[PDB]
Ligand binder design. Structure first.
Ligand SMILES: CCN1CCN(Cc2ccc(-c3cc4c(N[C@H](C)c5ccccc5)ncnc4[nH]3)cc2)CC1
Length: 305
């Protein structure tokens, strides 16, 4: 319905200096790097994505869909595209999230992550997701591995590789085949490939469950083909040790069968907020990056146009 007037910024390879792999694998490579725009006199820590080195018409069409989705979002809890680079190999350029992905970070820091932070991340992810819902956009791959950490106090949703904008008031996206992560999908997704803001809510549920168990693997063991039946029987993920029943009842709600019975992200914000005001009431936990002339460095969140 509304026209998407986002600007896509095309960036010169000369404008940015790579500085080391951060992750290789399926997709391709992600690099730490710096971006020095025009003459501006500002340097911008960036991450730079390159979906493998291979230039198969397949690959290139996908990375441009991300660029498309990422360029159209603008919210403190959603990762924004800074620009693309049209080298032989199409590069995605984004704000550097120096602490990496949230999944790895809870893992690597169990003995130091307190309730204030767990609940705050929950709120922040709810905000990201609520905003995505506003822009009528369905992520389809929300998971702890897809939330990045700019600072321990500030997280942002990423990985729009599967995100689908909902056209002519279409209330559910009917999907193809392809590899899809089962352990984070609503039931309507596994059975009917229906995806809706409310199936995003389910994945939220599981994401929250990853954070609360400090990075456990949902249904660890149980292999993927079993999942839809396990869920049909009525089984859900167990209550994490640190969780009060208040918090777990929120997860469980996100995992209901009737999609409209699940909470809305705007409600999830409210509830986790309340909870964030008294975190020890709601979680029971025992115990409760700069490397070369950094004079003109500015974080992307302060670089506007
Ligand atoms: C001590 C723990 N250890 C070291 C820190 N990390 C390594 C790491 C650091 C940064 C990142 C990172 C990825 C990333 C990122 N990747 C996404 C998928 C992306 C999206 C579009 C364009 C480029 C990247 N985007 C923005 N900032 C980012 N930062 C990934 C892994 C994890 C494990």
């Amino acid at each position: 319905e509304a026209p998407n007037q986002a600007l896509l910024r095309i960036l010169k390879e000369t404008e940015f200096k790579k500085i080391k792999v951060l992750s290789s694998g399926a997709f391709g490579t992600v690099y730490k790097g710096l971006w020095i725009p025009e003459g501006e006199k500002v340097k911008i820590p960036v991450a730079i994505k390159e979906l493998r080195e291979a230039t198969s018409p397949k690959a290139n069409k996908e990375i441009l869909d991300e660029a498309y989705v990422m360029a159209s979002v603008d919210n403190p809890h959603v990762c924004r595209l800074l620009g693309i680079c049209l080298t032989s190999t199409v590069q995605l350029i984004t704000q550097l999230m120096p602490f990496g992905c949230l999944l790895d970070y809870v893992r690597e820091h169990k003995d130091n992550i307190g309730s204030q932070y767990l609940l705050n991340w929950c709120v922040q992810i709810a905000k990201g997701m609520n905003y995505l819902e506003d822009r009528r956009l369905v992520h389809r791959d929300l998971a702890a591995r897809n939330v990045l950490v700019k600072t321990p106090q500030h997280v942002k949703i990423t990985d729009f590789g599967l995100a689908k904008l909902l056209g002519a008031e279409e209330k559910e996206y009917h999907a193809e085949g392809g590899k899809v992560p089962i352990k984070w999908m609503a039931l309507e997704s596994i059975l009917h490939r229906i995806y809706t803001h409310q199936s995003d809510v389910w994945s939220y549920g599981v994401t929250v469950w990853e954070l609360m168990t400090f990075g456990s693997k949902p249904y660890d063991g149980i292999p993927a083909s079993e999942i839809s039946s396990i869920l049909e029987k009525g089984e859900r993920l167990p209550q994490p040790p640190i969780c009060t029943i208040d918090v777990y009842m929120i997860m469980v709600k996100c995992w209901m069968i009737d999609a409209d019975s699940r909470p809305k992200f705007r409600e999830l914000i409210i509830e986790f907020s309340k909870m964030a005001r008294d975190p020890q009431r709601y979680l029971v936990i025992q115990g409760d990056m700069d490397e070369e002339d950094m004079d003109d460095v500015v974080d992307a969140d302060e670089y506007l146009i």
